[PDB]
Write a protein that holds these residues in place. Structure first.
Motif, short mmCIF file in Angstrom:
data_model
loop_
_atom_site.label_atom_id
_atom_site.label_comp_id
_atom_site.label_asym_id
_atom_site.label_seq_id
_atom_site.Cartn_x
_atom_site.Cartn_y
_atom_site.Cartn_z
N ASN A 168 0.85 -1.18 0.00
CA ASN A 168 0.00 0.00 0.00
C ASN A 168 0.89 1.24 0.00
OD1 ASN A 168 -2.32 1.59 0.03
ND2 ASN A 168 -2.41 1.61 2.28
N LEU B 174 -9.02 -7.18 4.23
CA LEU B 174 -8.68 -5.84 4.72
C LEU B 174 -9.97 -5.10 5.09
CD1 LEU B 174 -5.87 -5.03 2.07
CD2 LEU B 174 -5.62 -6.04 4.35
N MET C 152 -10.79 -2.61 6.81
CA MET C 152 -10.87 -1.16 6.79
C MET C 152 -11.01 -0.59 5.39
SD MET C 152 -7.54 -2.34 6.71
CE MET C 152 -7.21 -2.48 8.47
N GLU C 153 -11.06 -1.43 4.38
CA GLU C 153 -11.14 -0.96 3.01
C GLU C 153 -12.55 -1.17 2.46
OE1 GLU C 153 -8.92 0.44 0.91
OE2 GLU C 153 -6.97 0.18 1.88
C1 LIG Z 1 -3.59 2.43 2.54
O1 LIG Z 1 -3.10 3.74 2.69
C2 LIG Z 1 -4.11 4.76 2.68
C3 LIG Z 1 -3.38 6.07 2.85
O2 LIG Z 1 -3.43 6.53 4.19
C4 LIG Z 1 -5.16 4.51 3.77
O3 LIG Z 1 -6.23 5.43 3.60
C5 LIG Z 1 -6.35 6.76 3.83
O4 LIG Z 1 -6.46 6.26 5.16
C6 LIG Z 1 -6.56 7.30 6.14
C7 LIG Z 1 -6.47 6.63 7.49
O5 LIG Z 1 -5.13 6.26 7.78
C8 LIG Z 1 -7.86 8.07 5.92
O6 LIG Z 1 -7.95 9.13 6.86
C9 LIG Z 1 -7.88 8.64 4.50
O7 LIG Z 1 -9.15 9.23 4.24
C10 LIG Z 1 -7.61 7.54 3.47
N1 LIG Z 1 -7.49 8.11 2.14
C11 LIG Z 1 -8.03 7.56 1.05
C12 LIG Z 1 -7.81 8.30 -0.24
O8 LIG Z 1 -8.68 6.52 1.10
C13 LIG Z 1 -5.69 3.08 3.71
O9 LIG Z 1 -6.52 2.84 4.84
C14 LIG Z 1 -4.52 2.10 3.69
N2 LIG Z 1 -5.00 0.73 3.59
C15 LIG Z 1 -4.43 -0.31 4.22
C16 LIG Z 1 -3.24 0.00 5.08
O10 LIG Z 1 -4.86 -1.45 4.10
#
Ligand SMILES: *[C@@H]1O[C@H](CO)[C@@H](O[C@@H]2O[C@H](CO)[C@@H](O)[C@H](O)[C@H]2NC(C)=O)[C@H](O)[C@H]1NC(C)=O
Ligand SMILES: *[C@@H]1O[C@H](CO)[C@@H](O[C@@H]2O[C@H](CO)[C@@H](O[C@@H]3O[C@H](CO[C@H]4O[C@H](CO)[C@@H](O)[C@H](O)[C@@H]4O)[C@@H](O)[C@H](O)[C@@H]3O[C@@H]3OC[C@@H](O)[C@H](O)[C@H]3O)[C@H](O)[C@H]2NC(C)=O)[C@H](O)[C@H]1NC(C)=O
Ligand SMILES: *[C@@H]1O[C@H](CO)[C@@H](O[C@@H]2O[C@H](CO)[C@@H](O[C@@H]3O[C@H](CO[C@H]4O[C@H](CO)[C@@H](O)[C@H](O)[C@@H]4O)[C@@H](O)[C@H](O)[C@@H]3O[C@@H]3OC[C@@H](O)[C@H](O)[C@H]3O)[C@H](O)[C@H]2NC(C)=O)[C@H](O)[C@H]1NC(C)=O
Ligand SMILES: *[C@@H]1O[C@H](CO)[C@@H](O[C@@H]2O[C@H](CO)[C@@H](O[C@@H]3O[C@H](CO[C@H]4O[C@H](CO)[C@@H](O)[C@H](O)[C@@H]4O)[C@@H](O)[C@H](O)[C@@H]3O[C@@H]3OC[C@@H](O)[C@H](O)[C@H]3O)[C@H](O)[C@H]2NC(C)=O)[C@H](O)[C@H]1NC(C)=O
Ligand SMILES: *[C@@H]1O[C@H](CO)[C@@H](O[C@@H]2O[C@H](CO)[C@@H](O)[C@H](O)[C@H]2NC(C)=O)[C@H](O)[C@H]1NC(C)=O
Ligand SMILES: *[C@@H]1O[C@H](CO)[C@@H](O[C@@H]2O[C@H](CO)[C@@H](O)[C@H](O)[C@H]2NC(C)=O)[C@H](O)[C@H]1NC(C)=O
Ligand SMILES: C[C@@H]1O[C@@H](O)[C@@H](O)[C@H](O)[C@@H]1O
Ligand SMILES: C[C@@H]1O[C@@H](O)[C@@H](O)[C@H](O)[C@@H]1O
Ligand SMILES: C[C@@H]1O[C@@H](O)[C@@H](O)[C@H](O)[C@@H]1O
Lengths: 153, 153, 153
Positions: free
Chosen positions: A89, C104, C106-107
């Protein structure tokens, strides 16, 4: 399906087992006591979410994470078995690689299967080679993982 | 990807569960008690390192080992699920095959996936067919495994 | 190995965890307590045999079953990892699909690998996409699974 792979990565996986007192530092935890089949921890089963780094320092900025499990599985010496996902990621790679097989700890090198991939690694297949870089008792280990993809789409 | 495979093996896997008192003879051990979802051992999880023999005798010289796990997973009858590696280390074959799937114990025959291979089995894919040859209560079982590879490199 | 798959299924997986008191209704059970690595159930390991339905009702006539396991694997938030078999036994489809990878949580969407298949799904390979449809505390969840095969034999 040949000698040279179509994509090759080399990096280090780190494992810091939870010891009851190191929540912030640990990356993995055993979920069962070993049943007692021999003295080499047969059946000890560990779930992990550990960093993948380009150098040998577990504190380096990770290029990926490894999420999955391993367990020990030999009565008369140490041996283990793994199944896990490398999760990328970063601005460079976004996707996953799924890996499983026998981590033959008594061998200088050993190969596991890359059985699939997603995202930037869609439909990957290949080999993951493990070499032990360092182990410190039962507290920490570091594996050099060489990912060799032979199908790249 | 057709009827006849490019490589076909037929051999027997043996499992002798650890009973608390048979360390030298056991090849496998349960790592948890079943949680109690029905009376067919749902959730009982077993790690194994068992011999693969050409005949039905668990004491025969092994041609390979099977390392991995199985668990029971049905509430109202016996059913199981496997993931494991066949490890070959003989003058004849050196390599591994990675296998996973549903061991539908109530069926006369059932198929699991060969998802990868290493060494002499580099990049293998195919089917592993299980038939039950014998079970003795909860102490021992023997499975005839028919390995059919459909990609051979 | 392209955009459009050769076979596409979309259906719902249901999980009703055993709570000590709901044997008849439960489809899954945890086999260990979480070891205590964070507050998000890291290491909680669940075996399941759950229904796959075309609509969102867990009581609908199943088109398949999902048999396998999942576990939670993140210290600071919820994340999980799955390996399982979709088992088809209807007049329409008879066979299995083997799937593994990182769920995942959180996605909004995430992909697991279809690593093999048997029967009507002989030698399948592809992607299984998960989206969360509903979760109710720790008692129930429903996942929309989109199966996209890219090798169909
Ligand atoms: C992958 O990385 C992205 C970049 O941070 C993560 O998503 C962002 O996540 C944060 C929380 O850490 C949010 O506040 C933002 O709104 C997100 N941005 C977008 C454009 O989605 C994501 O959660 C990560 N995924 C993993 C680590 O599985
Ligand atoms: C998070 O977890 C990590 C991994 O467990 C923690 O890092 C480990 O920390 C221990 C100390 O707690 C450390 O062990 C110590 O290592 C030093 C240095 O040893 C190296 O360098 C020497 C030369 O300076 C060389 O001679 C040695 O061979 C080593 O290469 C030793 O001098 C100490 O004696 C101590 O060693 C341990 O001593 C007891 C013995 O039982 C044990 O086997 C031996 O390892 C680890 O090296 C270190 N590991 C890593 C990979 O960095 C880290 O502190 C944790 N973080 C937090 C915040 O808790
Ligand atoms: C390592 O583990 C293995 C596997 O557990 C051990 O081998 C098993 O040993 C048991 C005895 O401990 C043995 O059971 C006995 O089998 C004989 C023979 O039965 C067969 O032949 C009969 C004809 O002679 C036939 O009529 C039967 O149907 C069988 O085909 C029986 O006569 C005994 O009564 C006993 O049977 C058991 O009796 C109790 C009952 O609860 C149980 O269900 C029944 O099995 C197993 O056959 C044998 N298994 C194998 C695969 O060899 C071995 O001893 C262990 N080694 C060490 C060093 O401990
Ligand atoms: C087998 O297991 C299933 C899954 O656990 C059981 O079904 C679940 O049953 C519970 C009750 O035991 C039920 O929860 C109740 O839901 C109603 C309806 O809520 C919905 O509709 C409302 C509009 O009518 C809407 O406003 C809500 O947002 C919901 O959409 C609630 O009104 C109840 O208050 C109760 O809700 C629960 O209340 C306590 C709280 O802690 C909890 O978070 C909350 O869920 C589930 O909805 C239901 N789940 C499903 C998927 O059907 C089933 O009974 C079991 N069968 C047997 C035989 O035991
Ligand atoms: C595979 O078999 C070989 C043959 O024995 C094993 O390695 C030899 O291992 C013995 C220990 O049993 C050592 O003393 C020799 O030095 C080894 N020889 C060589 C040339 O390496 C090896 O460990 C086995 N690997 C398995 C079973 O995974
Ligand atoms: C798949 O479905 C068939 C249809 O019922 C199952 O087999 C029949 O199973 C019943 C028991 O429920 C037996 O009484 C019949 O004799 C069986 N018929 C035939 C032709 O075999 C079978 O067990 C199911 N398999 C699963 C669910 O894995
Ligand atoms: C290198 C190690 O890192 C961590 C610390 O808790 C140890 O004391 C040691 O410094
Ligand atoms: C065949 C079986 O092998 C083992 C022995 O401990 C049993 O007594 C029996 O002989
Ligand atoms: C929808 C739910 O289904 C089940 C019942 O035990 C609950 O009471 C509720 O009706």
């Amino acid at each position: 399906d040949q000698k040279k792979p179509c994509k090759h990565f080399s990096f280090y996986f780190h494992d810091i087992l939870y010891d009851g007192d190191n929540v912030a530092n640990a990356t993995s935890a055993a979920i069962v006591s070993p049943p007692g089949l021999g003295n080499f921890k047969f059946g000890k089963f560990v779930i992990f979410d550990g960093p993948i780094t380009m150098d040998k320092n577990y504190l380096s900025k990770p290029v990926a994470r490894a999420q999955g499990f391993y367990f020990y599985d030999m009565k008369m010496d140490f041996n283990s078995w793994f199944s896990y996902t490398l999760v990328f990621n970063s601005t460079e790679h976004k996707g996953t690689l799924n890996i499983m097989g026998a981590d033959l700890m008594m061998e200088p090198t050993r190969d596991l299967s890359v059985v699939g991939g997603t995202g930037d690694f869609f439909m990957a297949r290949g080999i993951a080679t493990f070499v032990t870089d360092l182990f410190q008792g039962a507290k920490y280990f570091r594996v050099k993982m060489d990912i060799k993809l032979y199908e790249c789409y």
